[PDB]
Design an enzyme around this catalytic site. Structure first.
Site, PDB file in Angstrom:
ATOM      1  N   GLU A 143      -8.005   5.385  12.183  1.00 53.68           N
ATOM      2  CA  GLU A 143      -6.954   5.771  13.095  1.00 53.68           C
ATOM      3  C   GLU A 143      -7.194   7.122  13.665  1.00 53.68           C
ATOM      4  OE1 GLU A 143      -3.029   5.601  11.005  1.00 53.68           O
ATOM      5  OE2 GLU A 143      -4.263   4.648   9.439  1.00 53.68           O
ATOM      6  N   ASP A 179       0.804  -1.184   0.000  1.00 51.85           N
ATOM      7  CA  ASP A 179       0.000   0.000   0.000  1.00 51.85           C
ATOM      8  C   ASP A 179       0.841   1.238   0.000  1.00 51.85           C
ATOM      9  OD1 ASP A 179      -0.365   1.188   2.988  1.00 51.85           O
ATOM     10  OD2 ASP A 179      -0.458  -1.068   3.089  1.00 51.85           O
TER      11      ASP A 179
END
Lengths: 79, 273, 273, 79
Positions: free
Chosen positions: B94, B6
């Protein structure tokens, strides 16, 4: 596979088979070590959710073998 | 286990072929953050990955605590990936928030899931602090660095596990994250259905014999009266009866002239396995 | 097949030992006719038969068409046999009547059946002309003379079959009727319950194996979780498990260390039979 | 024997087993050649009366496997 019905040994297998007839699908004994990841709808019949694969979609269960069967016939009716 | 990388705008202009040379089966690229941040490399990252025949993902970096905000971010993420068709998409959780944000997460996902297969990404502690098991309707991409095996709550299985955030390849700026990706998840995002074993039987004594075979094969049984599509089953076993009774996909038939020899044939087949 | 005789006042004073010498296992004696006719030999016929340890029956010769009348006759028949305890009693149907008298018959029987096991006696043509299948709640004593095997409607089985009305024994006046009496009926009037074979199993795979054994034995199965009285079963078979799981009446145990060897043991037992 | 439940092969066996649990009695497959003369109550589950022993006491049956099961649970409830 679109649908599968899981049961534990005993009276709940009876109920699981009526549900599988109505869904036109297979059943599987919960004791069998099986990969459920590619099943769209995993129905369990009888008992409690913790006895079953984390892949469980719907649990149909009452507090006796008889009310488990009733709940399965009611699910079938409302389908 | 296979691996996937990623990347985001922090990595600049990426020659994705460098990663494909290293064995990565695809690229998950950052598309967006919050309500207004557009990742200006997403389009080319998706484009070069899809063009080369590799797996694509798109991730959104959440900044929501409320349902309303989650919905605004969801619409914004879809706007950012419009004109691209990633194999799957990712809600990356997050953000600083208080309490249980599970309903806001579901609001995001409800919107995005009508268009794409969604995955939830977070670390172990985020799960414990901010989620409840309602989230488990979606697969898990667990971030767990430094561990030999990932540990998490609510979910029992992961679809992907991000094991480092410090990958580095000369010619790519910044750090790249690497993840293990399971064979079950790869099947899922490819639409691959195949069931391995199924035992068919007709009403009566042969069902007894069929269950023994299915115990041995660790698979399902199905009553032959049930109208079913067997096209995706690899091994279709039948117990009792004649071939003509069963699906054109049948590949093993165990049957005797009586219920007893059918049972003996099943036990003999089980032994020979 | 065993035989039984029937007698009435037309036979006068009967030395029933003449009939027991000929092999008859008992005596069915006429007690009453209609609403007021008392058979004056009934008491001694019952008495001498019961005293000698033989089977007793008492019959009532009906003369009713209506419910009311049937009830009067029923009470009268009970009054006639008071002070005697025949093994069973008989509603003898030969009266002139019109149409379907089944409800009147049931009215009689409802009264008498609270005190005695009842049987219905009639010929083939009476059945066709005057009864319906509601009568079949009671066993049949069919009168069918001259035939090698009895033929009748509504019922499928007889308990007794009166095959002649022209029996004769020197020292007994008139004719005596003789009947075959089935072993099933003799068991019934003696209270003899014994089931021959039962297969027990516990929930799960062993039930599969148990059904095969029960097919071979042509008998019932019973789940061991069911609280049941096995004292009357002659052969109690169990499949799978340990002796300690089952009734103290258990006499055959077929079991292996796995579900598969239990099944193989059952098939081996079936072969050796 | 006080009670026995007869079924034909197939879905009705499921229903017959729930009834036998409630009666705490045996079941028997209708294909088995058996002497019913010494059974007080012979219950049949599913189908029609002519398929069964003349010794039949009570037939519990609906027009589909599902209504047969419902009728058996209703019999159980009212017992």
């Amino acid at each position: 596979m679109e649908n599968l019905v899981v049961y534990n040994d005993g009276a709940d297998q009876r109920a699981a088979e009526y549900l599988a007839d109505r869904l036109a699908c297979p059943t599987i004994n919960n004791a069998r070590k099986f990969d459920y990841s590619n099943v769209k709808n995993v129905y369990a019949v009888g008992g409690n959710k913790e006895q079953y694969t984390s892949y469980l979609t719907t649990l149909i269960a009452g507090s006796t073998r008889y009310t488990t069967m009733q709940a399965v016939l009611d699910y079938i009716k409302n389908l | 286990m296979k691996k996937i990388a990623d990347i985001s705008n922090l990595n600049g202009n990426v020659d994705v072929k460098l990663l494909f040379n290293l064995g990565y089966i695809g690229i998950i690229a950052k598309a967006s953050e919050g309500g207004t941040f557009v990742d200006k490399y997403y389009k080319q990252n998706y484009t070069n990955t899809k063009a080369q025949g590799k797996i694509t993902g798109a991730y959104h970096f959440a900044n929501f605590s409320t349902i309303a905000k989650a919905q605004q971010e969801a619409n914004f993420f879809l706007n950012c990936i419009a004109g691209t068709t990633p194999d799957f998409v990712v809600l990356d959780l997050e953000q600083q928030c208080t309490g249980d944000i599970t309903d806001a997460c579901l609001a995001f996902l409800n919107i995005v899931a009508k268009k794409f297969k969604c995955v939830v990404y977070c670390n172990s502690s985020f799960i414990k602090e901010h989620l409840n098991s309602k989230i488990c309707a979606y697969p898990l991409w667990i971030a767990n660095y430094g561990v030999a095996t990932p540990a998490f709550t609510l979910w029992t299985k992961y679809a992907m596990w991000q094991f480092t955030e410090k990958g580095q390849v000369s010619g790519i700026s910044g750090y790249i994250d690497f993840s293990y990706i399971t064979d079950e998840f790869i099947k899922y995002i490819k639409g691959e259905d195949e069931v391995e074993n199924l035992v068919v039987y007709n009403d009566g004594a042969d069902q007894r014999a069929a269950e023994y075979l299915a115990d041995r094969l660790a698979c399902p049984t199905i009553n032959n009266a049930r109208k079913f599509d067997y096209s995706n089953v690899k091994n279709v076993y039948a117990v009792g009866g004649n071939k003509e009774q069963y699906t054109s996909y049948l590949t093993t038939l165990i049957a005797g002239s009586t219920r007893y020899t059918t049972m003996q044939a099943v036990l003999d087949y089980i032994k020979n396995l």
